[PDB]
Amino acid sequence: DEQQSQAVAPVYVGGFLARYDQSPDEAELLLPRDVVEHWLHAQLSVALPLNINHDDTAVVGHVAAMQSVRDGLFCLGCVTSPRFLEIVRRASEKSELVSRGPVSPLQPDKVVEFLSGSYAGLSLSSRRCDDVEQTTPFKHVALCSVGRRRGTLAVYGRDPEWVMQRFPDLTAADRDGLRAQWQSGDPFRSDSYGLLGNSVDAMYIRERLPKLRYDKQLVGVTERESYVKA
Amino acid sequence: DEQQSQAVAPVYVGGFLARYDQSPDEAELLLPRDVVEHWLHAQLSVALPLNINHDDTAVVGHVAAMQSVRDGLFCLGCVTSPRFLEIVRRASEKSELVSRGPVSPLQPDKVVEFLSGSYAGLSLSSRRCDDVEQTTPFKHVALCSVGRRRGTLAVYGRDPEWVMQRFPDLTAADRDGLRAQWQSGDPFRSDSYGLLGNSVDAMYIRERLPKLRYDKQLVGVTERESYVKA
Ligand SMILES: *[C@@](O)(C(=O)NCc1ccc(I)cc1)[C@H](C)NC(=O)[C@H](CC(=O)n1cccc1)NC(=O)[C@@H](NC(=O)CC(C)(C)C)C(C)(C)C
Ligand SMILES: *[C@@](O)(C(=O)NCc1ccc(I)cc1)[C@H](C)NC(=O)[C@H](CC(=O)n1cccc1)NC(=O)[C@@H](NC(=O)CC(C)(C)C)C(C)(C)C
**Which chain A residues have a beta carbon less than 8 Å from that of B196?**
87, 90-91, 94, 192, 195-196, 199
The C-alpha R_g of chain B, in whole angstroms, comes to 17
In 10 A of CB B55, how many CB atoms? 17
Resolution in A: 2.7
Active-site position among A68, A92, A126, A140 = A140
Q: In terms of Cα–Cα distance, which of B133, B138, B132, B96 is closest to B113? A: B96
Which residues lie closer than 8 Å to B227 by C-beta, 6 or more apart? B102, B106, B109, B112, B113, B116, B155, B156, B157
Q: CB burial class (10 A; 0-12, 13-18, 19+) of residue B177?
A: middle
Contact call for A196 and B194, based on CB within 8 A: no
Q: Is the dihedral of CA A217, A222, A228, A229 positive or negative?
A: positive
CA A112, A114, A116: angle at the middle one, nearest 5?
Answer: 70
CA A136 to chain centre: 20
Mutate to test the interface with A, among B93, B193, B216 (most CBs of A within 10 A): B193
- Annotated catalytic residues of B are 54, 123, 140
In chain A, what residues touch B203 (CB-CB under 8 Å)?
97, 117-118, 145, 199, 202-203, 208
Helix axes B110-118, A192-202, angle to 10 degrees: 60
Query: DSSP per residue over A7-73, as a string?
Result: HTS-EEEEEEEE-TT---SSGGG---HHHHHHHHHH---SPPEEEETT-TTBEEEEEEEEEEETTEE
Indicate if A41 belongs to the active site: no
Residues lining ligand 1, CB < 6 A? Answer: A 28-29, 54, 123-129, 139, 142, 144, 146-149, 205
**d(Cα B181, Cα B40) in Å, to the nearest integer?**
13
Question: Does any CB of chain B come closer than 8 Å to the CB of residue A229?
Answer: yes
DSSP annotation of B158 reads S
Give every CB contact of residue A118 below 8 A, 6+ residues apart in sequence: A145, A199, A202, B199, B200, B203
DSSP B6-38: HHTS-EEEEEEEE-TT---SSGGG---HHHHHH
Kindly report the nearest CA distance between residue B5 and chain A, in angstroms: 17
Q: Report d(CA A137, CA B4) in Å as an integer.
A: 41
Q: Which of A38, A54, A95, A192 is catalytic?
A: A54
Residue type, B45: S
Residues framing ligand 2 (Cβ under 6 A): B 28-29, 54, 123-128, 139, 142, 144, 146-149, 205
Instruction: Give the 3-state secondary structure of residue A99.
Output: helix
Cα torsion B61, B65, B70, B73: sign: positive
**Cα B189 from chain centroid (whole Å):** 19
Neighbours of A34 (CB within 10 A): 9
Query: How long, in residues, is chain B?
Result: 230
Task: Using CB atoms, pick whichever of B118, B194, B201 lies closest to residue A200.
Answer: B118
Q: Are A140 and A50 spatial neighbours (Cβ–Cβ below 8 Å)?
A: yes
Closest CA to B166 of B98, B219, B123: B219
Long-range contact set of residues B49-52: C-beta below 8 Å, sequence gap at least 24? B49/B140, B49/B141, B49/B187, B50/B13, B50/B77, B50/B78, B50/B79, B50/B140, B50/B141, B50/B142, B50/B143, B51/B140, B51/B141, B51/B142, B51/B143, B52/B84, B52/B119, B52/B142, B52/B143, B52/B144, B52/B190, B52/B195, B52/B198
Could you tell me if B46 lies within 8 Å of chain A, comparing CB atoms? no
Q: Other C-beta atoms within 10 Å of A64: how many?
A: 23
Whether residue B51 contacts residue B190, with contact meaning beta carbons closer than 8 Å, is answered with no
Through-space distance between the first and last CA atoms of chain A, rounded to whole angstroms: 31
Query: What are the start-end ranges of the H helices in chain B?
Result: 2-7, 33-42, 82-92, 96-99, 110-118, 160-165, 172-182, 192-202, 208-219
B34 exposed, middle or buried (CB, 10 Å; 0-12, 13-18, 19+)?
exposed
Method: X-ray
Give the integer Cα–Cα distance in Å for B192 and B195.
5
Ligand number, closest to the Cα atom of A55 = 1
Breaks (C-N over 2.5 A) in chain B follow: 43, 134, 183
Helices (H) and strands (E) in chain A, counts: 9, 7
In this structure, the residue with its CA closest to atom 22 of ligand 2 is B125
Nearest to A14 by CA among A56, A66, A59: A66
Would you list the domain boundaries of chain A? Answer: 1-230
Which CATH number describes the domain made up of B1-230?
A: 3.20.16.10
SS3 A80: coil
Give the Cα separation of B35 and B50 in Å (integer): 22
B32 vs B4: CA distance, rounded Å: 43
Q: How remote is the CA of residue B125 from the centroid of ligand 2, in Å?
A: 5
Cα(B144)–Cα(B52) distance, integer angstroms: 6
Residues 51 through 70 of chain B touching chain A, CB cutoff 8 Å: none
Residue A193 in contact with partner chain B when CB distance is under 8 A: yes
Which strands form B72-79's sheet, in the order they lie side by side? B121-126, B138-144, B49-52, B59-69, B72-79, B11-18, B155-157
- What's the CA gap between B213 and B221, in Å, rounded? 10
**Rounded distance between C-alpha atoms, residue B87 and residue B96, angstroms:** 16
Which residues partner with B157 through β-bridges? Answer: B12
Query: CA A61 to CA A47: how far, in whole Å?
Result: 9
Rounded distance, CA B217 to CA B60, Å?
27
How large is the angle between the packed helices A110-118 and A82-92, nearest 10 degrees?
Answer: 90
The chain A residue lying nearest B228, using CA atoms, is: A204
